[PDB]
Design an enzyme around this catalytic site. Structure first.
Site, mmCIF file in Angstrom:
data_model
loop_
_atom_site.group_PDB
_atom_site.id
_atom_site.type_symbol
_atom_site.label_atom_id
_atom_site.label_comp_id
_atom_site.label_asym_id
_atom_site.label_seq_id
_atom_site.Cartn_x
_atom_site.Cartn_y
_atom_site.Cartn_z
ATOM 1 N N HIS A 119 43.416 38.561 71.177
ATOM 2 C CA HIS A 119 42.744 38.923 72.101
ATOM 3 C C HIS A 119 43.548 38.504 73.386
ATOM 4 C CE1 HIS A 119 38.761 39.610 74.738
ATOM 5 N NE2 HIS A 119 38.654 40.273 73.640
ATOM 6 N N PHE A 120 42.736 38.853 74.705
ATOM 7 C CA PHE A 120 43.407 38.574 75.926
ATOM 8 C C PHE A 120 42.495 37.842 76.721
ATOM 9 C CE2 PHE A 120 43.433 40.620 80.513
ATOM 10 C CZ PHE A 120 44.620 40.294 80.730
ATOM 11 N N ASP A 121 42.731 36.746 77.733
ATOM 12 C CA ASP A 121 41.876 36.228 78.553
ATOM 13 C C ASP A 121 41.925 36.784 79.877
ATOM 14 O OD1 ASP A 121 39.924 33.730 79.386
ATOM 15 O OD2 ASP A 121 41.360 33.897 80.762
#
Length: 124
Positions: A119-121
């Site tokens: 995922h990405f933040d």
């Protein structure tokens, strides 16, 4: 039947440095991955750099994100992201994306042994 990571990448690490355009990559990737289903993605941050480095970023520097959630990792250096957004024009199925070119540290979410980003933040 992807290990999440590959698909996450194809949704996010668009790839290939290109300090130009904006809209083109934005809509192109979304179309190419046919993410313009039922409702399109109001925001998404497209990386345009060495996918190899992304897997390194994952295994570089944990930063306590603005929550302390997951175990988010900041990039070594600022990377080329095209921050993609739907303009106040996007009218599904006539979705209308526009990107913002910025050099910022991608903040990715690594896990899923062998450890790969899934995922990405955010990017800063």
């Amino acid at each position: 039947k992807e290990s999440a990571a590959a698909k996450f990448e194809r949704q996010h690490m668009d790839s290939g440095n290109s300090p130009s355009s904006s809209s083109n990559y934005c809509n192109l990737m979304m179309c190419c991955r046919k993410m313009t289903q039922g409702k399109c993605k109001p925001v998404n941050t497209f990386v345009h750099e060495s996918l190899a480095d992304v897997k390194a970023v994952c295994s570089q520097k944990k930063v306590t994100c603005k929550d302390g959630q997951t175990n988010c990792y900041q990039s070594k250096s600022t990377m080329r992201i095209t921050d993609c957004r739907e303009t106040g024009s996007s009218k599904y199925p006539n979705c209308a994306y526009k990107t913002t070119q910025v050099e910022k540290h991608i903040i990715v979410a690594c896990g899923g042994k062998p450890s790969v980003p899934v995922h990405f933040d955010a990017s800063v």
